[PDB]
């Protein structure tokens, strides 16, 4: 898990008050994250191209050139004349270094390596016509973004000629903006580039995590004198889509529950066909350890209401379009909504907003902060999931969970983990990283299918 941050101003400043550190320091240990970057994606004779802007971040590109002097063939355009002083102050070092730098004009930018480091995280609605990072990056193997790729905001928008890098080095810790489902497109892999001192001490207190593989915790059992009733009771609920249903169950058995059973509401499933392996029931267990309901569901059942003081839950797609999933908001249950789903659950809410909520989608922080006992599960690009105060953004999935049914088996998971007593906000957390990490174990990012999905799952390494 990484601290995140909407800006990082506070850190910086506090960097230079609370640390000690000077602007210097700071400056020239970004430079030496670029550095590292380079001699990891290119060989000791390349020829790297760096695009300085007139602020801090063209500093961080002007203090690499220098750096590299030497052990690279360096040409450094100079976008924007120099500002800042210690923009002013890198540019004279650079020269003084052995640096060739030139001034750009639209009137062989082919390079080994390209590096933007042209505006950071001050850019201001828009990009000029001569910063057409595609066109200027069009004959460049690698492209390295410093900080964040010119031409993202705070609120994670994108300009349409934003750059678009391989890898995006956040300078001190990870900011918001970098994160948006939008950007995923430009910001390429997203690694921390550290200022002279450890993270920890770096950062300060938030309420924005992104995920790591390693915060990942497997249902694996440790104990043995365990029992099939120690792993939980799931029940799913089979809408008029019974497919959906039936893959969540199958998902749930897969991942752990130590028993599945199903119930068929607006379908026509017995001890009919219905999969070997699955439990099937007339009517809902007064002993269980937690539902799923939504997938593939048409209208809210009668005796909902009963059943949210029988067990946790995870509530799904069909739900979030009836007024009847207000009752759940006070409950413990996690909602594993889409953004249309969402749009509408915010209305019954009191609420309504366009799908101009894209442009806000995380701070999803009110909205838990509004609904205290829920997990909300925003799904998108990148994934948002909201407990009271924090969030936590998956960023790992592929493209390849586009395909319907997908979302089945990722309420199978959230399903099982809550039947293994995990609590609402691990189970929504760790079903989300399984789900995705899995879904990178396919050759094709074309060929993902459920029930596939569900094997690479049984045994995500």
Not at 312 to 327: N, R, S
Request: glycine share 8%.
């Amino acid at each position: 898990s990484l601290s995140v941050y909407e800006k990082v101003n506070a850190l910086d400043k506090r960097a230079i008050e609370e640390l000690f550190l000077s602007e210097d320091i700071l400056m020239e240990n970004a430079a030496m994250a670029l550095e590292r970057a380079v001699l990891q994606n290119a060989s000791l004779g390349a020829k790297v191209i760096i695009l300085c802007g007139s602020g801090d971040n063209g500093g961080d590109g002007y203090a690499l050139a220098r750096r590299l002097v030497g052990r690279f063939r360096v040409l450094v355009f100079e976008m924007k004349l120099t500002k800042s002083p210690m923009c002013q102050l890198q540019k004279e070092r650079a020269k003084k270094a052995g640096v060739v730098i030139k001034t750009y004009e639209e009137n062989n930018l082919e390079c080994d390596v390209l590096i933007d480091c042209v505006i950071g995280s001050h850019f201001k609605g828009k990009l000029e016509p001569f910063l057409n990072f595609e066109s200027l990056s069009q004959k460049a193997r690698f492209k390295i973004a410093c900080d964040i790729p010119s031409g993202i905001d705070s609120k994670g928008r994108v300009d349409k000629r934003a750059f678009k890098a391989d890898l995006t080095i956040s300078m001190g810790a990870i900011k918001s903006c970098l994160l948006s489902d939008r950007a995923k497109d430009y910001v390429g892999e997203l690694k921390v580039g550290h200022l002279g001192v450890f993270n920890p001490i770096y950062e300060i207190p938030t309420d924005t995590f992104l995920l790591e593989k390693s915060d990942l915790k497997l249902p694996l059992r440790d104990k043995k004198n365990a029992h099939k009733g120690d792993y939980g009771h799931a029940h799913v609920l089979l809408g008029k889509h019974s497919g959906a249903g039936l893959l969540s169950a199958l998902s749930a058995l897969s991942f752990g529950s130590g028993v599945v059973s199903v119930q068929a509401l607006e379908c026509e499933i017995t001890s009919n066909n219905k999969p070997l392996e699955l439990v099937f029931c007339e009517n809902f267990p007064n002993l269980l350890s937690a539902f799923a309901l939504g997938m593939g569901l048409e209208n809210i059942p009668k005796d909902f209401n009963r059943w949210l003081e029988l067990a946790p839950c995870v509530l799904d797609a069909g739900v979030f379009y009836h007024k009847e999933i207000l009752q759940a908001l006070e409950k413990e249950a996690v909602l594993t909504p889409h953004p249309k789903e969402f749009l509408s659950l915010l209305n019954l809410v009191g609420i309504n907003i366009s799908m101009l909520e894209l442009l806000d989608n995380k701070l999803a922080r009110d909205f838990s902060q509004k609904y205290p006992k829920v997990v909300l599960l925003l799904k998108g690009a990148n994934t948002l999931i909201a407990h009271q105060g924090q969030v936590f953004i998956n960023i790992l999935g592929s493209v390849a969970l586009a395909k319907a049914g997908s979302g089945d088996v990722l309420a199978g998971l959230i399903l099982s983990l809550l039947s293994q007593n995990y609590t609402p906000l691990d189970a929504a957390i760790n079903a989300s990283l399984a789900h995705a990490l899995a879904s990178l174990e396919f050759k094709n990012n074309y060929a993902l299918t459920p029930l596939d999905l569900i094997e690479k799952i049984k045994q995500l390494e």
